[PDB]
C-alpha cells in the first residue's frame, strides 16, 4: 500500500537496503505502480494524508497533483513530520534521508539511466520545492538535497571508472586491436552516463538549490548550505570551486544562527581535508574579515566554530591571518563562555607556544601583562588548562624561575606568582573558576588519581620552596597575599610523614614575620586563613602550629593593651602617627579574631573602650572605628560558639547577652555617623547580629538559648531602613565598568542584609513597602532581590504581603502628589508606570481570595479617606483606584459584588450620578 | 480556518541579501568579559539571590561562626 511504504521507513526495523531492494524489484515488474508509491511516499513524508491515484498520475501534471494534495492534506495542526520533536521523528528524519540515498546508489548502474524514474522523482521534488505549503517545500527540499548528494556519489563513481578504464586502454595500447576498440566504446558509454548524471544534478541545482538556499524559512536555508558543504567535501575535484563556494560566502551573513553555523561546519570540512587547495585561498582572502568578525557572533556556538575554523586556517597556511586578527582572537581567552575561551586558548597555544618550558612560561607571563583586560590570571589559566596542561603544571620550572637567578622584572614576577597560583588552584581544585564551570560534575577514576597525585606533588615541592619565596618577597603586599594561599591546597599529613617539620617551622616563622611587618587588609586575611587551614584537628601538626599561633596572639594582644593604655589616657592627646600604630595592631587582631577562637584573651574590653571614646568625643579615625566594630562582632560570635554546650557554663551567659546588648546600641549610633564606610560597617554587622540573635536561634532543638532575647526596637527598625533608602536606592544616571559593578554588588549585599530581616520577621513587614515600590525603577540593579523577598513575604503571610503591596502603591501615589499636586494629569507616563507596576504586581497572584479582598478593602479606604476641602463632597484620593482596577482581574466572581457592598459603604448615591474627572470611579466599578 | 502553514513569501529578495552582506553589525556583539578583578570574581561566586539570602553581610571565615548564621534560617 501507499501508506505501507511510508510507515515502513518511519518504522523500518529494516536494513534500509532491504526496503530499497524490495522497492526496486517492484519497479522491474511494473514501473508505473512502483513510481506511484514513491510519489505517494514523498507526499506522505510531508504529513499530507491525501493520496495520488493512477488516473492522477497518468493524465494530471504535477502542479495539479500538488494543488489536489494541498486540498486533501487534511492536517489537524501546523506540524508536519520534519518539525515534530521526539526520538521517533528524528529517527524518521534519518530513515527518510538514508532511503533516498540508498535508493539512488542502488539504481546507479542501470535503472537510473532508464530516463523514466529519476525524471519523475526530480520533477516531483522540484514542483513541491516551489510550493507555498511549507510541509511540502521543506520536505521536498530535504529530499532533493539528499537526492543530490547521491548523484554526486554516482558521478564520483563514474569519474573513477572512467580513469580506471583510461588506464586499461593506455596499458593495452602500450603492449589485439579489437580490445582497444571495446575499451574506447566503454569510455564513450561511460561519458554518456556522466552527461546524464550532470543533467540531473544541474536540474536539482538550478531548480531547487539556487532558490531554496535563500528560502524565507531558515531551516530550509540550512538544509541547502549543509548539503553543498557535503558535495564540496566528497567530490572536491568537481565541486570545490568559487562557483559553489560563493553560496557559502554569502550565507555566512545570514541573520539566523543555525544557518551561519552550517556555513562554518561546511568550511571546517574543507580544511581538515587540508590538502593543498588554492581555490580556497581566493575564498579566504575575500571572506577572512567576516570569519574573524564571527569570533564575536551574537550566538555562542557560531563563535566557537568561527574560532575553530580560524585555527585550521593557521595550520593550512598561517601567513594569511595578520596580527590584528590574531590579537582579536587572543582577547577571547578572557570571555565569559568557556567553549569560546578554550577555543581561543587553542588558537593562542598554536600560534605562539611551540628547563625547556622556561621560555614558554615567560611568554605566557608576557602575554598576560600585555593584554590589559584582566588583573588576575584565573580565566587565562582556565582557557588553557585543556590544551597546555603539560606546561601550566611545571611548577618546579616556575618555582626556581622566581628564585634561582636579563632577569625578571617586578611586574613579571608578580604576574608569574598569580599565574602559578592560578595553575595550583585549578590543579588542586579540579574545576574551572566561577562562571566557567559546570554544575557540580564529579570526577572520573583517572581524574581522581590525577587529582590526588598533583596535590601531593604540590605539597612536597612548595613545603620547601614556599618559605624561601615568602622571604624574598616579604615586602610586596601583592605577592605575599598570593603566596599565602598555597597551604590551603596542601595535604598536611605529608608535612609530618615526609621529614618536613623543619620547613613548616621555617615558614610559620616567615608568616609571623609578615603579619608583624604589614598592615594591608588582604595580607592579613591571608595570614589568618592559612593559620586556620594549618590548625586542622584531623591532622597531627595541630599542636605544633597551635603553639606558634598562641605565641603570635600573646604578643599582639599584650601590645594592643599597651597601646590602648597610652592612646586613651585623658591628657595624652594622641596624634595621627599614634593613630597608625593602634590601627596596625587592631587590624592584625581583627583579621585573626575572625577565623580563630580568641576568647582566652578576653578582648571585648579594649574594643568597647575605644568605641565608647569615638562616640563621646566624635574624634576617631574611621579605620579604628570600622575595625573595632569588626573585632567586637567576632568576640560575640566566638563566645556564642562556646555556648554550643552548657558543659561550659550557666553564669557566663548573663555577660554574653549584655555585650550583645551594648554592642547593638553602639552600632546603632555609628549608623548615623557622617562617614559612609562607618555607617555601612555598623549597618552590615547589625543585620548579621539581629539575624543571629533572632527568635530563630532555637527552634532547631536549640531551646537552651531563649534568654538571648534581642528583638529590634521601632527606632532601629526604621533607621535600618533609613540606611537602605539613602545608600541603596540612589539617583541613577542613564571608574568605568569594573568599579561601578563592584559598587552595585556591595549595594546589593546591603539590601539583601535588610531583606533577610524582612523575610525572617526580625523587623515588621510593613518596612518592605518602601522597598517593593522600587521594583520597576531599580529592576536590573536590585530586581531579583526585590521579587524574591516579596515572594518570601508572600509565602509567609499572603495578605499582609498584599497589604504592604498596595501601601507601596499608596506610597508611590503620595510621592506623585508631594511635589506636583492634586490636579496632576492622570494619564502621565509617570502615572501610567505606577499603573503598569501594579499590573505586574497583580500577576504575582490557593488562598488568593481574601488576600485580593483586603487588597481592595485598603485601596478603598485610601481612596475616600480624605475628602476634597473646596469641592463637591470630587475626593482627594479618587484616581488611585484606576491602579487598583488592574487588580480586579484576579478577583473572585462572588466577591466581585462584595467589592461593591464595601465600595458602597463609602460611595454616596450622588457620586455615581456625576461623570466627566470622576471617570476612575466609573471604570473601577465597571471592572467588577 | 485551515492550520496548514502556507508561506506567502518563499524567498528573500536580492536587495535584502545585498543588505545582509553590507551590514552584520546586528549579528555581532562586544566581548562579554569574565570577571576581571579578583573581587569581582568573588562577588559572582557569592552573588545571585540564593547565596546572598543564605550568607551573612559581614563574611565569617571560620565555619563555626558561619554555622551560627546558617542555623537561624528556618
Amino acid at each position: 500500500e501507499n501508506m505501507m511504504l511510508f510507515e515502513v521507513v518511519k518504522m523500518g526495523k529494516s536494513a534500509m537496503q532491504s526496503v530499497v531492494d524490495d522497492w526496486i524489484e517492484s519497479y522491474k515488474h511494473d514501473r508505473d505502480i512502483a513510481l506511484l508509491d514513491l510519489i505517494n511516499f514523498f507526499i506522505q513524508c510531508s504529513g499530507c494524508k491525501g493520496v495520488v491515484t493512477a488516473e492522477m498520475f497518468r493524465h494530471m501534471q504535477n502542479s495539479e497533483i500538488i494543488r489536489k494534495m494541498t486540498e486533501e492534506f487534511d492536517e489537524d495542526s501546523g506540524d508536519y513530520p520534519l518539525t515534530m520533536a521526539g526520538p521517533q521523528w528524528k529517527k524518521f528524519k534519518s530513515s527518510f534521508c538514508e532511503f533516498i540515498g540508498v535508493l539512488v546508489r542502488q539504481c546507479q548502474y542501470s535503472i537510473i539511466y532508464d530516463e523514466y524514474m529519476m525524471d519523475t522523482v526530480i520533477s516531483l521534488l522540484t514542483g513541491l520545492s516551489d510550493s507555498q505549503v511549507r510541509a511540502f517545500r521543506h520536505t521536498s527540499t530535504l529530499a532533493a538535497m539528499k537526492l543530490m548528494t547521491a548523484l554526486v556519489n554516482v558521478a564520483l563513481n563514474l569519474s573513477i571508472n572512467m580513469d580506471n578504464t583510461q588506464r586499461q586502454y593506455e596499458a593495452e595500447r602500450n603492449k589485439a586491436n579489437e580490445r582497444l576498440e571495446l575499451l574506447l566504446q566503454k569510455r564513450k558509454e561511460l561519458q554518456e552516463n556522466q552527461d546524464e548524471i550532470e543533467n540531473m544534478m544541474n536540474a536539482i541545482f538550478k531548480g531547487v538549490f539556487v532558490h531554496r538556499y535563500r528560502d524565507a524559512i531558515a531551516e530550509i536555508r540550512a538544509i541547502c548550505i549543509e548539503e553543498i558543504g557535503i558535495w564540496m567535501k566528497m567530490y572536491s575535484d568537481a565541486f570545490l570551486n568559487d562557483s559553489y563556494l560563493k553560496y557559502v560566502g554569502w550565507t555566512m551573513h545570514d541573520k539566523q544562527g543555525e544557518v551561519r553555523l552550517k556555513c562554518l561546519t561546511a568550511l571546517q570540512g574543507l580544511y581538515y581535508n587540508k590538502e593543498l587547495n588554492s581555490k580556497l585561498e581566493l575564498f579566504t582572502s575575500r571572506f577572512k574579515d567576516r570569519i574573524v568578525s564571527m569570533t564575536l557572533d551574537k550566538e555562542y556556538d557560531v563563535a566557537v566554530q568561527a574560532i575553530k575554523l580560524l585555527t585550521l586556517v593557521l595550520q593550512s597556511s598561517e601567513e594569511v591571518l595578520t596580527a590584528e586578527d590574531c590579537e582579536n582572537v587572543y582577547h577571547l581567552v578572557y570571555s565569559a563562555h568557556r567553549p569560546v575561551a578554550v577555543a581561543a586558548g587553542e588558537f593562542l597555544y598554536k600560534k605562539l607556544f611551540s628547563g625547556p618550558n622556561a621560555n614558554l612560561v615567560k611568554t605566557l607571563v608576557f602575554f598576560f601583562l600585555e593584554s590589559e583586560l584582566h588583573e588576575h590570571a584565573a580565566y587565562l589559566v582556565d582557557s588553557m588548562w585543556d590544551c597546555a596542561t603539560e606546561l601550566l603544571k611545571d611548577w618546579e620550572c616556575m618555582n626556581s624561575l622566581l628564585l634561582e637567578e636579563e632577569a625578571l622584572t617586578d611586574r613579571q614576577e608578580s604576574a608569574l606568582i598569580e599565574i602559578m597560583l592560578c595553575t595550583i588552584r585549578q590543579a588542586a581544585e579540579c574545576h574551572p573558576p566561577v562562571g566557567r564551570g559546570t554544575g557540580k560534575r564529579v570526577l572520573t577514576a583517572k581524574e581522581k588519581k590525577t587529582q590526588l597525585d598533583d596535590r601531593t606533588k604540590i605539597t612536597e615541592l612548595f613545603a620547601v620552596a614556599l618559605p624561601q619565596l615568602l622571604a624574598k618577597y616579604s615586602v610586596d603586599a601583592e605577592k605575599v597575599t598570593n603566596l599565602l594561599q598555597l597551604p590551603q591546597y596542601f595535604d598536611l599529613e605529608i608535612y609530618t610523614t615526609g621529614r618536613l617539620e623543619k620547613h613548616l617551622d621555617a615558614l610559620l616563622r616567615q608568616i609571623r614575620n609578615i603579619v608583624e611587618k604589614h598592615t594591608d587588609t588582604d595580607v592579613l586575611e591571608a595570614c589568618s586563613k592559612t593559620y586556620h587551614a594549618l590548625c586542622n584537628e584531623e591532622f597531627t601538626i595541630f599542636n605544633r602550629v597551635d603553639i606558634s599561633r598562641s605565641q603570635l596572639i600573646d604578643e599582639l594582644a599584650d601590645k594592643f593593651n599597651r597601646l590602648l593604655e597610652d592612646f586613651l589616657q585623658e591628657g595624652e592627646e594622641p596624634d595621627e602617627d599614634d593613630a597608625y600604630q593602634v590601627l596596625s595592631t587592631l587590624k592584625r587582631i581583627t583579621a585573626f579574631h575572625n577565623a580563630h577562637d580568641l576568647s582566652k584573651w578576653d578582648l571585648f574590653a579594649c574594643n568597647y573602650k575605644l568605641l565608647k571614646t569615638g562616640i563621646e568625643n566624635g574624634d576617631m579615625p574611621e579605620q579604628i572605628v570600622i575595625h573595632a566594630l569588626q573585632c567586637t562582632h567576632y568576640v560575640i560570635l566566638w563566645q556564642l560558639a562556646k555556648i554550643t554546650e552548657s558543659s561550659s557554663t550557666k553564669e557566663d551567659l548573663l555577660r554574653l547577652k549584655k555585650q550583645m546588648r551594648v554592642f547593638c546600641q553602639i552600632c546603632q549610633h555609628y549608623l548615623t555617623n557622617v562617614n559612609t564606610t562607618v555607617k555601612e560597617q555598623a549597618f552590615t554587622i547589625l543585620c548579621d547580629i539581629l539575624m543571629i540573635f533572632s527568635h530563630q536561634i532555637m527552634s532547631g532543638g536549640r531551646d537552651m538559648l531563649e534568654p538571648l532575647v534581642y528583638t529590634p526596637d521601632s527606632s532601629l527598625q526604621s533607621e535600618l531602613l533609613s540606611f537602605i533608602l539613602d545608600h541603596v536606592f540612589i539617583e541613577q544616571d542613564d571608574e568605568d565598568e569594573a568599579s561601578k559593578i563592584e559598587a552595585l554588588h556591595k549595594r546589593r549585599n546591603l539590601l539583601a542584609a535588610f531583606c533577610k530581616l524582612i523575610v525572617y520577621t526580625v523587623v515588621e513587614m510593613n518596612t518592605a513597602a518602601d522597598i517593593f515600590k522600587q521594583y520597576m525603577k531599580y529592576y536590573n540593579d536590585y530586581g531579583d532581590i526585590i521579587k524574591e523577598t516579596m515572594s518570601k513575604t508572600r509565602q509567609i503571610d499572603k495578605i499582609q504581603c498584599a497589604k504592604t503591596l498596595i501601601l507601596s502603591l499608596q506610597q508611590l501615589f503620595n510621592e506623585m502628589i508631594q511635589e506636583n499636586g492634586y490636579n496632576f494629569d492622570r494619564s502621565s507616563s509617570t502615572f501610567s508606570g505606577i499603573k503598569e507596576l501594579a499590573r505586574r504586581f497583580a500577576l504575582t497572584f490557593l488562598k488568593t481570595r481574601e488576600a485580593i479582598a483586603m487588597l481592595h478593602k485598603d485601596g478603598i479606604e485610601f481612596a475616600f479617606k480624605e475628602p476634597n476641602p473646596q469641592g463637591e463632597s470630587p475626593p482627594l484620593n479618587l484616581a488611585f483606584l484606576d491602579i487598583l482596577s488592574e487588580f480586579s482581574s484576579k478577583l473572585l466572581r462572588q466577591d466581585k459584588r462584595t467589592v461593591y457592598v464595601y465600595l458602597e459603604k463609602f460611595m454616596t448615591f450622588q457620586m455615581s450620578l456625576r461623570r466627566e474627572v470622576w471617570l476612575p470611579l466609573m471604570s473601577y466599578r465597571n471592572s467588577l | 480556518k485551515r492550520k496548514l502553514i502556507v508561506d506567502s513569501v518563499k524567498e528573500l529578495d536580492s536587495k535584502t541579501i545585498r543588505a545582509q552582506l553590507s551590514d552584520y553589525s546586528d549579528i555581532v556583539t562586544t566581548l562579554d568579559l569574565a570577571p576581571p578583578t579578583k573581587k569581582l570574581m568573588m562577588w559572582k561566586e557569592t552573588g545571585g539571590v540564593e547565596k546572598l539570602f543564605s550568607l551573612p553581610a559581614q563574611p565569617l571565615w571560620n565555619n563555626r561562626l558561619l554555622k551560627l548564621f546558617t542555623r537561624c534560617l528556618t
Binding site: 539556487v210 568559487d242 562557483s243 563556494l245 560563493k246 560566502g249 554569502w250 581566493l282 575564498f283 582572502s285 575575500r286 571572506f287 | 529578495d13 536580492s14 541579501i17 545585498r18 552582506l21
Partner: peptide, 9 residues
Amino acid sequence: VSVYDFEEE
C-alpha cells in the same frame, strides 16, 4: 574576487 560579487536577479 569578482565571481563572489553577488549579482543574482
